[PDB]
């Protein structure tokens, strides 16, 4: 028993009680407690229906069942020592908190005759992950992955703190002046415009409304929630911009108040550094973790579990095929028919009648003709019997048994049976008015018959199938996380949206279904912050307890998108590594079988090929591409547009000269050099040609052999991929054909939502402004039709595409829920259960199928660095440690002499000086965070007392490092160069702040950039930053393609969309237009992010009106815009999203050694600290040191590199003589070769006589030695 104590067994047969079902009645009790929290309905102001009263009478019964078992485990176990032991166990504490925190609130309630103590009850569903151990191990593989990510999450925090401080300084207090009607407190906005700032006499947007005056006192831009005028609001609004959701409205607001020309930089830089760079780092680290994890499994035993059972299944079906033809094998003709069926001809005539069906499905549209309807009923009843015949013929032609076995022949059974089941159901009089829709839904299955035609992902789909044990368990614990949060949302925000506005806040938290939907919308990121502003306003406002709701909102986005990395990416890094290894395994299975049955002309060329000559042309492409971008779109009669036209006729003479001279010497990429030159001379349909004039820049790529080689790689990335691109296209067609059968005819609405159809929606109706019934305006009413609808299949697909991008999916979802009937107007919450289609599509496309697309480009690039096979005597860990030992080079330290300077030298390099001065940067942060808006005047001057008192300190750590290090040794470190710059930059600011009052916000950033000095101490952050900054700088070509793409799109965009008018209320306004090249590029950047990118597409599609400064014949004011916007916008979103997964994966795979390092055994992190101890024995390098200090070097070393936590008398004395080393004069053994045998010992350890054999290997596979190994051989 080993009880270690005990009272007798007078009642302690409680350990007998607990056998099989008590573990499962208390698992059934807890599921009944989660349905009682679900069916609760939160009502405003203490109002309750009668089911909420009977549900708090259920809570008492659920409070004792959980409360007696919490006593029957403190008696089934033993006395109090046992209690402490239990405390160690995680599950008991969780199960004891919940039911001690449950009796605590039932008694303060029952005394009281607390509505925030009711909240802890939501914690109950976690008690359910306690009673399943198959889910307890899924949580630990979540939490284990967390440690590698720590250096990132510390870097994100120090990046929000810089831009919260900088942003605050730059934009503090600026956004408090909105437009107002004269002599009134009504804010004056246009119809679809939100309230944005003004400026009297500055650079901002002045009022241009008929009767408005710009005055201060406005609280701020989103009910005062967003702005930068203390530290908590500055940092809430920098965190929001980092998640790329609503970062342009902040930028637009900032311009409007401060001005247009500078604040683009703070935001663009933040987005680029803050999200894209960090996203790449996080993604790379996680992937490395997965590879390491895969490594621990596959080398242990997990390869043979999936190889045998895939071979023992394919040997089983071969064994069962030898049976099913045997027992199976009355007329010879039938056999002949079967043979014909096997015959290929039948495989090009199953694709004939399946292609009839796709066409039939796609031809459903709304308000179609009457012949088109009846042809689909003819072709259906034909192809049902054609589908009948094949099944009958197939099942009767090759055997009834082995028809059963196929993964696709089972479905061919299901088609014709439920094909005839509909044709028997309607043709009995039993359409059943929903079933005439519900039974038509199933002949949408016939387009799934082409799934067998792939034979390409037939390897991966199968792998996926095995894994539906492993697929499902993480999705189970993401689903248990959306429940807890939904319940929590219900507690904080249920019944709290009682705003007296007349506007619709439809993503609320009132039911459980609605709460769940709201929670899902915050995880997809979509419009998540406009869900948060309703929750700050449901509490007080932007006040002290009102804004602490925001932390709850933040946790759901951060900790909930940590699960979505471990789920989806785990799937896409593990199950696309088995299905690749097995593809190589079926490849080593492949050709080993097929080997068995087998067994004056000279001068011009020189000038042209001259290097000097090339650099004269590639700065005429640099001038001609600045002339395309300087063009003015609206006014063709400008002096600018004329005088740039002479720069057209300058250069395209010179590229002609390049062309004709090129066909003096020589007799695909040069058919592009012919075309560009002809286009200009022709252009001096003209309109179409001009767009084809921006491709001059592309030709520059041949010019650069790097740019030649990278367009080749991008073209290669289109080879292996286009089965994923095909599979997704076939599925985007299945959801678009379900969505047509569900939402066709139904996205119409009236202008006022009382008039339910088109015959009614005619006339005028009254709108009411700000919900005031005394103030109304007449507006005509029209039968509007949604801009994204499901009305033919092509239309349905566009909507689905927009939804995958996650932009506007919430609007579409709401439109879908309200949809009424075939041609009527909407009903509020008519069919809430049509969220299932959208959610399923999102999980299927945007989560799961795009993540085997990032997980595919990776694994076909791991093998780009693995198809090169290095089977020499030295493995991976040898190349990254011996080649480092060849090419190593010593540091410097500069220990000086003249002991007056040595006095200053040791004071500065101490630990308690690095502790003093990295505790004064921490005080300079807090003095800069204390700044706020409308602070006091005593707060106003001590901020200038303090900022002058910090500058005198940091000027005096700079003199102490000049005199000690003897300034040659001072500008040797790059961190003393940067620290010299932040010192001098803040002395001038002390001057320039004080010559101001004795008689520049850019210099006040020299106070905050001294916080970057905190990277000089953190070793692990800086090795992470250096690794990627090295790689981005080593791969500029990869990013170049993105830049080239932006340049090409911007040039086209000014040319088509350039003449829309900047009317405000639309999405082409004074912040978001295509008028200038810088503006167009900014607009494109907004698109990479996906901000309202569909909206912009809608804005510029033909119907739009041209600005008055353009020219057009009168009466034709409404004729600009173009329909090319659909292609252009779709194209940019797809080319920019493919070049971004090409850039991320290219940078993850140049640092694959850092990321799959496994820091336990060895790295260069030991090889660094060797030299940093060797720096104490070398002032400058000189090669060698004395032998008296060699034994004192080995005492300083970590034992995985040197010698142990033991005493060095036996092992470290004997080995240093016995293991080899070069013997020069007494105190001369070199740096370059002592480090060799010191790491040749720790691994790659060899016997004697073959000390030439390590030097034999160090010349073949190794990078050239350079002649330095002649002391590293000996």
């Amino acid at each position: 028993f080993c009880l270690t104590l005990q009272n007798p067994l007078r009642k302690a047969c409680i350990s007998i009680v607990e056998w099989k079902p008590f573990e499962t009645i208390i698992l059934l009790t807890i599921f009944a407690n989660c349905v009682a929290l679900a069916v609760y309905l939160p009502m405003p102001e203490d109002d309750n229906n009668s089911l909420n009263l009977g549900l708090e009478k259920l809570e008492y019964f659920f409070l004792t069942v959980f409360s007696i078992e919490a006593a029957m485990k403190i008696i089934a176990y033993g006395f109090l020592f046992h209690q402490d032991a239990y405390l160690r166990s995680g599950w008991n504490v969780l199960d004891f908190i919940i039911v001690f925190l449950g009796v605590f609130t039932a008694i303060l309630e029952q005394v009281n005759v607390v509505k925030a103590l009711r909240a802890f009850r939501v914690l109950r569903p976690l008690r359910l992950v306690s009673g399943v151990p198959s889910l307890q191990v899924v949580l630990n593989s979540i939490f284990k992955a967390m440690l590698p990510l720590f250096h990132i999450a510390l870097l994100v925090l120090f990046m929000v703190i810089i831009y919260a401080i900088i942003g605050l300084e730059l934009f503090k207090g600026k956004m408090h002046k909105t437009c107002y009607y004269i002599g009134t407190d009504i804010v004056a906005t246009v119809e679809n415009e939100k309230p944005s700032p003004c400026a009297r006499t500055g650079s901002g947007r002045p009022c241009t409304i008929n009767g408005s005056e710009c005055r201060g006192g406005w609280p701020g831009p989103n009910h005062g929630i967003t702005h930068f005028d203390n530290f908590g609001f500055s940092m809430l609004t920098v965190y929001q911009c980092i998640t790329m959701e609503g970062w342009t409205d902040v930028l637009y607001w900032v311009n409007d108040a401060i001005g247009n020309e500078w604040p683009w930089i703070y935001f663009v830089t933040l987005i680029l550094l803050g999200s894209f760079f960090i996203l790449n780092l996080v993604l790379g680290v996680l992937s490395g973790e997965f590879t390491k994890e895969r490594e621990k499994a596959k080398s242990r035993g997990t390869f043979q579990k999936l190889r045998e059972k895939q071979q023992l299944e394919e040997d089983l079906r071969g064994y069962m095929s030898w049976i099913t033809q045997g027992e199976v094998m009355n007329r010879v003709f039938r056999w002949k028919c079967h043979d014909l069926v096997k015959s290929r001809v039948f495989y090009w005539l199953v694709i004939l009648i399946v292609a009839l069906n796709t066409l039939s499905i796609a031809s459903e549209h709304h308000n179609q003709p009457l012949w088109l309807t009846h042809l689909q009923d003819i072709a259906n009843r034909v192809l049902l019997s054609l589908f009948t015949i094949e099944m009958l013929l197939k099942m009767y032609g090759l055997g009834l048994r082995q028809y059963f076995m196929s993964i696709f022949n089972r479905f061919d059974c299901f088609v014709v049976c439920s094909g005839i089941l509909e044709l028997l159901l309607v043709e009995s009089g039993a359409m059943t008015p929903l079933g005439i829709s519900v039974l038509r839904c199933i002949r949408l299955l016939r387009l799934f018959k082409i799934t067998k035609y792939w034979t390409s992902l037939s390897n991966l789909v199968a792998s996926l199938l095995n894994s539906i044990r492993s697929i499902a368990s993480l999705l189970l614990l993401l689903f248990l996380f959306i429940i807890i949060f939904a319940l929590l949302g219900m507690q904080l925000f249920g019944g709290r949206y009682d705003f007296e506005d007349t506007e619709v806040r439809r993503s609320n938290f009132d039911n459980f279904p609605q709460a769940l939907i709201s929670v899902f919308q915050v995880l997809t990121g979509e419009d998540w912050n406009s869900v948060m502003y309703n929750g700050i306003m449901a509490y007080g406002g932007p006040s002290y307890p009102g804004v602490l709701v925001c932390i709850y909102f933040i946790i759901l986005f951060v900790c909930g998108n940590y699960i979505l990395l471990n789920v989806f990416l785990a799937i896409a890094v593990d199950n696309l590594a088995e299905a690749e290894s097995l593809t190589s395994a079926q490849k080593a299975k492949a050709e080993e079988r097929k080997r068995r049955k087998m067994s004056v002309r000279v001068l011009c060329h020189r000038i042209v090929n001259a290097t000097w000559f090339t650099n004269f042309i590639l700065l005429f492409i640099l001038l001609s591409s600045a002339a395309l971008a300087a063009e003015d779109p609206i006014r063709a009669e400008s002096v600018r547009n004329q005088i740039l036209g002479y720069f057209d006729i300058a250069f395209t003479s010179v590229f002609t000269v390049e062309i004709v001279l090129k066909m003096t010497t020589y007799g695909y990429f040069n058919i592009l050099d012919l075309l560009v030159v002809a286009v200009s001379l022709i252009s001096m349909v003209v309109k179409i040609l001009r767009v084809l004039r921006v491709l001059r820049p592309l030709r520059a790529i041949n010019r650069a052999k790097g740019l030649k080689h990278v367009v080749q790689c991008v073209f290669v990335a289109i080879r292996t991929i286009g089965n994923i691109v095909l599979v997704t296209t076939l599925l985007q067609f299945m959801f678009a054909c379900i969505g047509v059968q569900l939402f066709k005819g139904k996205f119409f609405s009236c202008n006022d939502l009382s008039k339910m159809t088109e015959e009614e929606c005619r006339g005028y109706y009254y709108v009411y402004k700000d919900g005031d019934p005394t103030q109304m305006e007449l507006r005509p009413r029209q039968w509007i039709h949604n801009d994204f609808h499901f009305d033919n299949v092509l239309s349905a697909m566009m909507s689905l595409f927009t939804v995958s991008t996650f932009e506007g999916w919430p609007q579409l979802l709401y439109r879908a829920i309200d949809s009424n009937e075939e041609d009527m107007g909407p009903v509020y919450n008519n069919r809430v259960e049509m969220a299932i289609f959208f959610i399923i599509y999102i999980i299927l496309i945007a989560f799961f199928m795009m993540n085997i697309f990032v997980g595919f480009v990776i694994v076909t690039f791991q093998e780009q660095g693995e198809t090169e096979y290095k089977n020499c005597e030295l493995d991976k860990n040898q190349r990254q440690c011996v080649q480092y030992a060849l090419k190593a080079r010593p540091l410097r330290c500069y220990i000086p002499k003249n002991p007056y300077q040595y006095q200053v030298w040791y004071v500065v390099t101490s630990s308690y000086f690095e502790y003093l001065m990295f505790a004064l940067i921490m005080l300079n942060t807090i003095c800069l965070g204390m700044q706020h808006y409308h602070q006091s005047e005593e707060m106003n001057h001590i901020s200038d007392i303090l900022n002058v008192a910090f500058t005198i300190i940091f000027t005096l750590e700079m003199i102490l490092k000049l005199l000690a290090f003897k300034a040659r040794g001072y500008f040797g470190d790059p961190w003393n160069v940067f620290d010299f710059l932040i010192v001098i930059g803040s002395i001038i600011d002390v001057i320039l702040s004080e010559i101001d009052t004795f008689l520049s916000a850019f210099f006040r950033l020299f106070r905050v950039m001294r916080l970057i000095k905190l990277l000089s101490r953190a070793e692990g952050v800086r090795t992470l930053l250096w690794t990627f900054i090295k790689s981005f700088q080593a791969l500029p070509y990869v990013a170049l393609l993105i830049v080239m793409l932006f340049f090409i799109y911007a040039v086209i965009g000014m040319q088509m969309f350039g003449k829309i008018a900047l009317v405000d209320g639309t999405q082409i306004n004074r912040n978001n237009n295509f008028q200038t090249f810088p503006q167009a590029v900014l607009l494109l950047f907004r698109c990479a992010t996906g901000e309202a990118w569909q909206e912009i597409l809608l804005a510029c599609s033909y119907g739009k009106l041209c600005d008055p400064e353009s020219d057009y014949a009168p009466g034709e004011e409404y004729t600009c815009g173009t329909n090319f916007a659909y292609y252009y916008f779709i194209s940019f979103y797809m080319l920019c999203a493919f070049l971004i997964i090409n850039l991320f994966v290219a940078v993850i795979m140049d640092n694959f050694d850092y990321l799959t390092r496994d820091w336990s055994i060895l790295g260069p992190h030991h090889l660094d600290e060797f030299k940093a101890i060797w720096a104490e024995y070398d002032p400058e390098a000189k090669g060698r040191i004395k032998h008296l200090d060699v034994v004192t070097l080995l005492r300083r070393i970590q034992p995985p590199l040197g010698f142990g936590k033991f005493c060095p008398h036996r092992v470290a004395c004997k080995r240093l003589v016995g293991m080899n080393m070069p013997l020069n004069s007494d105190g001369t053994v070199t740096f370059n070769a002592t480090l060799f045998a010191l790491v040749r010992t720790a691994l790659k350890i060899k016997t004697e006589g073959n000390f030439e054999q390590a030097n034999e290997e160090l010349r073949a596979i190794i990078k050239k030695i350079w002649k330095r190994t002649s002391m590293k051989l000996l």
């Binding site: 001098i984 001038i988 850019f1002």
Partner: protein, 100 residues
């Protein structure tokens, strides 16, 4: 005064760093050319306010001169900095301030 003076001081670090085999010294010479760059850009902003508070405005001869000496000194200073700071290390073995 600071934009002119800083430039003069910067020269004294730069003129003395081409002799006696010292190149560390240049590092500060590139600092003062960014500062002399940015102390015209305050000047540029300071001169704009005078014309904005005071009848039209047009600059021809010496705003676009100094806005070509801002962009010269501000960007010939940052590039001289990165053309004198050693390199990004590019290899796991290498370190900044690496010998020779």
């Amino acid at each position: 005064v600071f934009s002119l003076g800083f430039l003069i001081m910067g020269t004294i670090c730069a003129l003395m760093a081409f002799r006696k085999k010292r190149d560390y010294l240049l590092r500060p010479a590139s600092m003062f050319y960014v500062f002399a760059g940015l102390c015209l850009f305050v000047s540029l902003e300071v001169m704009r306010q005078s014309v904005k508070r005071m009848i039209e405005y047009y600059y021809s001869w010496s705003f676009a001169c100094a806005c070509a000496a801002f962009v010269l000194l501000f960007l010939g200073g940052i590039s001289l900095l990165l053309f004198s700071l050693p390199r990004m290390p590019q290899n796991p073995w290498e370190s900044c301030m690496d010998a020779e």
